[PDB]
């Protein structure tokens, strides 16, 4: 119950929400059916529309009008936004030359430049170039301010997941808004776009910007705008708030537009009907900027023009139906559309089986336009698993496609021509970023970055300390003229041991054999030096990685590679090696096929053993430093040390072997040398974070050798490829991956074919940021370079996407 017969007199768009059943006058009241009786009359005035005209200039104040043209309007803070232009011979903001804003130019009483977030729904990244002729206000912001060619949304590329990620700096798995539709088994409650449950606070995790601001003494405008409040009224409300007294005035504001998304769904992303919504958004920006200029805030406010996701062409006829794959379709619930999430219709049905559902959905038709996954097998870059609201079974749907349960779902609901929600690497899902103001740089283009980073920056813009989040604070310092955050490198927690020769061959009973007892004072001094780290400057180019947790490990040097060997996990945490453009690929000689050699620097008790692999009929082994890339027949023996061995399923070895034999050399050729760091990852609870030893669910049979869930590689070279990787004087270039360590290649539908037809495609799918690997390993890379730390932070957040331009 709301006693809706109090009054909004003097209270229109109050910043604090009053306790029901007192009636409300805030921008959320419409949504709760709780506004006072007179809300429309007082708060949603429309009389005479939104613009001053020649005849209204210096009129007599009529408090019924939507906005005012009377002489007193400036100090009342409620002029139409074009008041000065029509009535005082001023120019529109867009017609003014842009001039560098070197310092904030703010009215007295402003403690800090306000931040206005101008968010646009469905604003695909290529609209900036393609709609440029019809968006002059946006184009001035873009060319005069700081902009990226595009900004990567999070997965799924839907509205609430992305807007709440902008507000929190968190992945959807962590903030809890994991889709536009959801069931939470702990609450036993559902979340839907339509309706009221979505307003319950238990859905919304983390700490959004407006709470961060409030807790820290910075006042915030409201971020949610009820759909029936027109855009002109949202702008005028922001401008009115900006005229509040210093103690009452918020420092952060948000505008939101439903367009161009609303139209994009109906007409497709480039439908001829799309020009008009883009014009109208631009006019709204015009209104805000003219409004700010009138208030003398146009060189004071920092403005962020940001989208939540793009929009792709999608029609009813490009729909895959689960009824064409499954016989048991009625025993499942599907969250449908541009992604699929499957669960059992009833938890009383113990006959339901996820294994048989996956297999029935796997590679069944030649052009199948979705791929099933257990959530933990999704590309790690999606960060889409560690939440109970995310179903165990997931369908990644091809761009341009939908998945539905039965055909009747689609024609008893062609309506739409656009949709979004796909993999966040997809070009059509990329959205926009522009920052304009005293705190942003002038006429500066920055590289594409992910929207998870913006929360930190908006905190910097407001002098707030960000709550813990998934951004890498400092990675966006190059966007900013001032207020940069000066991060320090994390301290190393465990220092390595540097073992020398401490064990005789006969102390090892590992069941390993090697054909290696084949016999110089020149090359004996030489080999000792390699074992002491003589070539380390060649293979370890950026310093050794720091281990940021408590553990026991050894550094091991070799002619061709260096490793950090964990005495706890019995394998390297990392292995580093550099392959020059000129390097040669050789094969594993016949006499060395099954060779594994004890490492006399490392105790038998801290070593793997060959017998375990023999006994484990499912599990084989591979090497981190590939024997194929050995520098000489004698150095090749190093690659067969038991300390370079890792557990690998035979199916995975097909992947790994092609990577090491073919692709490393290809990249070295193309990139002019590469430095490679490879290692295991253990993430059995799929939280994106390094497992402790007591979290490991699988071991090589009858041993304490833990089985990785993934293998990573970080591949670094000179950004200026005219310099070799090992002699690079400037910025670096990186690509990385996190490959799932799986006992089958069911993920790759063409896997019966030659590795050259499928392997590289799989690696691309599992592309990753160095930062993702850091989370998963507790290592910190690039500790010793000649580059600035903020620059290295940007490099560690880089994702190589393998999309075209």
Ligand X SMILES: *[C@@H]1O[C@H](CO)[C@@H](O[C@@H]2O[C@H](CO)[C@@H](O[C@@H]3O[C@H](CO[C@H]4O[C@H](CO)[C@@H](O)[C@H](O[C@H]5O[C@H](CO)[C@@H](O)[C@H](O)[C@@H]5O[C@H]5O[C@H](CO)[C@@H](O)[C@H](O)[C@@H]5O)[C@@H]4O)[C@@H](O)[C@H](O[C@H]4O[C@H](CO)[C@@H](O)[C@H](O)[C@@H]4O[C@H]4O[C@H](CO)[C@@H](O)[C@H](O)[C@@H]4O)[C@@H]3O)[C@H](O)[C@H]2NC(C)=O)[C@H](O)[C@H]1NC(C)=O
Ligand Y SMILES: Cc1cc(OCc2ccccn2)c(C(C)(C)C)cc1Cl
The answer to the question of residue 469 lying near ligand X (CB under 6 A) is yes
Residue 523 buriedness (CB in 10 A; 0-12 / 13-18 / 19+):
exposed
Which residue's CB is nearer to ligand Y, number 254 or number 314?
254
Shortest gap between Cβ of 88 and ligand Y (angstroms)? 32
Longest Cα–Cα distance of the chain, Å, equals 106
Q: Identify the helix (H) or strand (E) that includes residue 88.
A: helix 83-88
180 makes contact, choosing from Zn ion, Na ion, Cl ion, none, with CB < 5 to 8 Å by partner type, with: Cl ion
Which residue's CB is nearer to Ca ion, number 120 or number 725?
120
170 makes contact, choosing from Ca ion, ligand X, ligand Y, none, with CB < 5 to 8 Å by partner type, with: ligand X
- The reply to whether 265 sits in an annotated binding site is yes
- The reply to whether 121 sits in an annotated binding site is yes
The answer to the question of residue 775 lying near ligand X (CB under 6 A) is yes
The answer to the question of residue 254 lying near ligand Y (CB under 6 A) is yes
Q: Considering only CA atoms, which of 495, 497, 475, 493 is closest in space to residue 485?
A: 475
81-89, 217-225, 232-240, 593-601 -> range binding ligand Y (CB under 6 A): 217-225
Please give the torsion angle defined by the CA atoms of residues 619, 760, 763 and 359, in that order, rounded to the nearest 10 degrees. -60
Shortest gap between Cβ of 632 and ligand Y (angstroms)? 58
258-266, 285-293, 329-337, 575-583 -> range binding Zn ion (CB under 5 A): 258-266
Sign of CA dihedral 10, 14, 16, 18: positive
First to last CA, the chain: 55
Please give the torsion angle defined by the CA atoms of residues 750, 754, 760 and 762, in that order, rounded to the nearest 10 degrees. 30
Strands 553-557 and 620-623: unpaired
Which residue's CB is nearer to Na ion, number 619 or number 655?
619
Which of 31, 159, 174, 417 contacts ligand X by CB under 6 A? 174
Which of 163, 314, 480, 602 contacts ligand Y by CB under 6 A? 163
Q: Considering only CA atoms, which of 116, 109, 112 is closest in space to residue 244?
A: 109
CB 255 within 8 A of CB 119: yes
Q: Is 762 helix (H, G, I), strand (E, B) or coil?
A: helix
Which residue's CB is nearer to ligand X, number 387 or number 675?
387
Contact positions with ligand X (CB under 6 A) in 206-225: 206
Shortest gap between Cβ of 390 and ligand X (angstroms)? 9
- Whole-angstrom CA distances from 562 to 487, 555, 556, 592, 625 are 29, 7, 6, 21, 9
Which residue's CB is nearer to ligand X, number 170 or number 480?
170
- Neighbouring CB atoms inside 10 A of 303's CB total 24
Binding flags for ligand Y, 165-194, as an x/- string (CB under 6 A): -xx---------------------------
Active site residue 767: no
CB neighbours of 133 closer than 8 A, spacing ≥ 6? none
The answer to the question of residue 659 lying near ligand Y (CB under 6 A) is no
Which of 27, 65, 137, 180 contacts Cl ion by CB under 5 A? 180
- Whole-angstrom CA distances from 68 to 52, 234, 270 are 7, 16, 38
Q: Is 209 helix (H, G, I), strand (E, B) or coil?
A: helix
- The reply to whether 313 sits in an annotated binding site is no
Shortest gap between Cβ of 386 and ligand X (angstroms)? 5
The answer to the question of residue 256 lying near ligand Y (CB under 6 A) is yes
# residues contacting Cl ion (CB under 5 A):
2
DSSP conformational letter for 687? S
Binding flags for ligand Y, 78-117, as an x/- string (CB under 6 A): ---------------------------------------x
Q: Identify the helix (H) or strand (E) that includes residue 775.
A: helix 770-777
Which of 232, 261, 391, 683 contacts Zn ion by CB under 5 A? 261
- CB environment 221-239: b (16+ within 10 A), e (fewer): bbbebeeeeebbbbbbbbb
260-268, 328-336, 447-455, 754-762 -> range binding Ca ion (CB under 5 A): 260-268
Shortest gap between Cβ of 235 and ligand Y (angstroms)? 14
- Whole-angstrom CA distances from 604 to 167, 509, 638 are 52, 7, 17
Which of 140, 175, 405, 741 contacts ligand X by CB under 6 A? 175
164 makes contact, choosing from Ca ion, ligand Y, Zn ion, none, with CB < 5 to 8 Å by partner type, with: ligand Y
- The reply to whether 685 sits in an annotated binding site is yes
Q: Identify the helix (H) or strand (E) that includes residue 147.
A: strand 146-147
Discontinuities in the chain with C to N beyond 2.5 Å fall right after 413, 519
The answer to the question of residue 179 lying near Cl ion (CB under 5 A) is yes
In the structure encoding, which two tokens stand for residue 234, read together? 């949202």
- The reply to whether 535 sits in an annotated binding site is no
- The reply to whether 689 sits in an annotated binding site is yes
Q: How far apart are CA 757 and CA 145, in angstroms?
A: 44
775 makes contact, choosing from Zn ion, Ca ion, ligand X, none, with CB < 5 to 8 Å by partner type, with: ligand X
- Neighbouring CB atoms inside 10 A of 87's CB total 21
- Neighbouring CB atoms inside 10 A of 776's CB total 24
CB 93 within 8 A of CB 137: yes
Q: What is the DSSP string of 203-264?
A: G--S--HHHHHHHTT--B------TTS-HHHHHHHHHHHHTS-TTT--SEEEEEEEEEHHHH
Which of 159, 431, 575, 751 contacts Ca ion by CB under 5 A? 159
Q: How far apart are CA 454 and CA 477, in angstroms?
A: 11
- The reply to whether 616 sits in an annotated binding site is no
| Active-site entry in 81, 146, 157, 159 | 159
Q: How far apart are CA 426 and CA 154, in angstroms?
A: 11
In the structure encoding, which two tokens stand for residue 164, read together? 């709440």
Per the annotation, where are the binding residues for Ca(2+)? 683, 685, 687, 689, 691
Contacts with Zn ion by CB under 5 A lie at 261
Per the annotation, where are the binding residues for 1-hexadecanoyl-sn-glycero-3-phosphate? 159, 180, 261, 420
Per the annotation, where are the binding residues for 1-tetradecanoyl-sn-glycerol 3-phosphate? 159, 180, 261, 420
Contacts with ligand X by CB under 6 A lie at 170-171, 173-176, 205-206, 383, 386-387, 468-470, 688-689, 775
Contacts with Ca ion by CB under 5 A lie at 121, 159, 261, 308, 683, 685, 687, 689, 691
Contacts with ligand Y by CB under 6 A lie at 117, 119, 160, 163-164, 166-167, 223-225, 254, 256
Per the annotation, where are the binding residues? 121, 159, 180, 261, 265, 308-309, 420, 683, 685, 687, 689, 691
Contacts with Cl ion by CB under 5 A lie at 179-180
Residues tagged active-site: 159
């Amino acid at each position: 119950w709301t006693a809706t017969s109090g009054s909004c007199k003097g209270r229109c768009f109050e910043l604090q929400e009053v306790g029901p059943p007192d009636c409300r006058c805030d921008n959320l009241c419409k949504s709760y059916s709780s506004c006072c009786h007179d809300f429309d009359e007082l708060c949603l005035k429309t009389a005479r529309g939104w613009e001053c005209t020649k005849d209204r200039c210096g009129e007599v104040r009529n408090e019924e009008n939507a906005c005012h043209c009377s002489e007193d309007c400036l100090s009342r803070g409620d002029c139409c936004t074009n008041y000065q232009v029509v009535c005082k011979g001023e120019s529109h903001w867009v017609d003014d030359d842009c001039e560098e804003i070197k310092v904030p130019e703010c009215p007295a009483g402003f403690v800090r430049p306000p931040l206005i977030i101008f968010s646009v729904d469905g604003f695909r990244a290529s609209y900036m170039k393609k709609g440029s002729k019809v968006m002059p206000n946006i184009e001035k912001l873009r060319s005069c301010g700081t902009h990226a060619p595009y900004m990567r949304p999070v997965y799924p590329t839907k509205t609430f997941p992305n807007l709440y990620t902008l507000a929190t700096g968190l992945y959807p798995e962590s903030h809890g808004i994991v889709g536009n539709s959801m069931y939470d088994p702990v609450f036993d409650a559902s979340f839907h776009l339509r309706g009221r449950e979505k307003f319950n606070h238990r859905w919304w995790g983390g700490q959004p910007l407006w709470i961060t601001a409030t807790k820290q003494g910075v006042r915030a405008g409201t971020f949610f705008w009820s759909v029936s409040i027109p855009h002109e009224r949202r702008i005028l409300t922001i401008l009115q708030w900006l005229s509040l007294p210093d103690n009452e005035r918020p420092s952060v504001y948000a505008f939101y537009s439903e367009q161009p998304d609303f139209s994009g769904h109906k007409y497709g992303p480039f439908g001829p009907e799309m020009t008009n919504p883009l014009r109208e958004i631009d006019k709204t920006v015009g209104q805000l900027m003219d409004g700010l200029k009138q208030l003398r805030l146009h060189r004071c406010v920092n403005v962020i023009f940001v989208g939540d996701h793009g929009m792709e062409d999608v029609t009813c006829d490009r729909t895959e139906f689960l009824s064409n794959y499954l016989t048991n379709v009625d025993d499942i619930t599907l969250v449908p559309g541009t992604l699929g999430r499957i669960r059992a219709k009833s938890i009383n049905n113990s006959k339901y089986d996820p294994k048989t559902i996956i297999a029935a959905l796997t590679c069944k038709k030649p052009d199948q336009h979705f791929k099933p996954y257990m959530k933990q097998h999704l590309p790690k870059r999606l960060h889409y698993a560690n939440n109970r609201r995310i179903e165990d079974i997931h369908l990644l749907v091809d761009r341009r496609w939908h998945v539905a349960r039965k055909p009747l779902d689609v024609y008893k609901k062609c309506f739409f021509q656009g949709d979004h929600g796909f993999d966040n690497k997809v070009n059509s899902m990329q959205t926009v970023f522009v920052g304009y103001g005293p705190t942003f740089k002038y006429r500066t283009k920055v590289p594409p970055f992910e929207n998870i980073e913006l929360y930190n920056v908006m905190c910097d813009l407001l002098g707030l300390k960000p709550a813990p989040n998934n951004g890498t604070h400092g990675s966006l310092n190059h966007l900013l003229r001032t207020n940069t955050f000066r991060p320090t490198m994390p301290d190393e927690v465990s220092r390595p041991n540097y073992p020398g020769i401490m064990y005789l061959q006969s102390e090892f009973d590992l069941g390993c054999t090697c054909d290696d007892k084949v016999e110089n004072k020149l090359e004996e001094l030489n080999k000792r030096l390699h074992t002491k780290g003589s070539t380390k400057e060649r293979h370890l180019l950026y310093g050794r990685p720091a281990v940021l947790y408590r553990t026991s490990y050894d550094i091991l040097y070799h002619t061709d590679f260096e490793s950090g060997y964990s005495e706890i996990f019995l394998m390297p945490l990392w292995t580093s090696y550099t392959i020059s453009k000129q390097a040669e690929v050789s094969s594993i000689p016949e006499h060395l096929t099954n060779c594994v050699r004890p490492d006399v620097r490392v105790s038998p008790g801290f070593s793997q053993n060959c017998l375990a692999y023999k006994n484990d009929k499912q599990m084989s082994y591979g090497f981190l430093f590939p024997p194929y890339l050995s520098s000489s027949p004698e150095a090749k023996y190093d690659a067969f040390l038991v300390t370079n061995m890792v557990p690998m399923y035979p199916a995975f070895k097909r992947v790994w072997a092609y990577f090491q034999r073919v692709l490393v050399k290809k990249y070295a050729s193309e990139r002019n040398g590469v430095n490679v760091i490879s290692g295991p990852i253990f993430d059995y609870n799929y939280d994106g974070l390094r497992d402790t030893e007591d979290e490991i669910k699988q071991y090589v049979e009858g041993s304490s050798i833990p089985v990785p869930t993934h293998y990573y590689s970080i591949i670094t070279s000179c950004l200026d490829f005219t310099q070799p990787a090992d002699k690079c004087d400037g910025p670096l270039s990186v690509s990385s991956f996190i490959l799932p360590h799986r006992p089958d290649n069911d993920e790759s539908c063409n896997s019966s074919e030659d590795e050259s037809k499928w392997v590289e495609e799989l690696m691309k799918m599992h592309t990753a940021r160095v930062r993702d690997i850091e989370h998963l390993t507790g290592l910190d890379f690039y500790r010793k370079t000649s580059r600035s730390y903020s620059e290295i932070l940007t490099l560690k957040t880089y994702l190589h996407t393998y999309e075209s331009e």
